[PDB]
Amino acid sequence: PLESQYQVGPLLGSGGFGSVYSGIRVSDNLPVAIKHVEKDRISDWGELNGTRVPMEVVLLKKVSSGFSGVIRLLDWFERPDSFVLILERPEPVQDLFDFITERGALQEELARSFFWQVLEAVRHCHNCGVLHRDIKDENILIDLNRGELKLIDFGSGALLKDTVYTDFDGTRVYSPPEWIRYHRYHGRSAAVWSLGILLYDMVCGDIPFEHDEEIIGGQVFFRQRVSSECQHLIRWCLALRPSDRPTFEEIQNHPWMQDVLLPQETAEIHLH
């Protein structure tokens, strides 16, 4: 019973996260987010046992662990017309889209710390067999007191595979040119493209491309002062041909990525 195990509060974010409600687990007063998904709106289905569940539940369960870089699924329920997902809710929180809107372009030291944490989170997903497919600032929560970032919203994700993907329901302005042009992509190199968009977003204050023509055009204009090392990493992630993009290892060994702050240092210097 969900209504007995949790005190359900008001809608979170007025629907901007979907049907996500504030909640508190009665057993130990743990803050939770209660996310409702309609069965009729579910694209991909998975199996858990023979239990047929939304793929989002499958992916969330596979990344659920002590690693704090991804949102933690605590439990889920099936209803006649929907599934209900119980997520551990950090507090206080602001998502990275709103953070950047309010702060503008981030100092590179702060962008480096945030980007590093996202890289570690995406590596965790991939190590667990999960491809997120919707990496963007809207899908990143900042724990403002701990300086820890959390990847959220696995509703566009897929099991990670090495063969080609021909479907996609993530965010188009973060999707790579081979998807725009050919409706085909491989998971890791597409993820690296979206991370280039995200890094540009952090250091310039908004994403670089709004239109298909800009995505495929292969030109990156910098609207803010950005170091040559950071520009190089961004341009490398945004290589037009997927095989020209860096691996996750090459990104984290890049000179711009060295000497990252710890999460607690990040919170004390930039967030408190």
């Binding site: 901007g16 889209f97 809107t101 919707d134 963007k136 809207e138 919203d153 509703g155 566009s156 329901d169 993530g170 965010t171 188009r172 302005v173 973060y174 204050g205 908004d206």
Partner: peptide, 8 residues
């Protein structure tokens, strides 16, 4: 310049 969210 207009910064906006983008739906998935």
């Amino acid at each position: 310049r207009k910064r906006r969210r983008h739906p998935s």
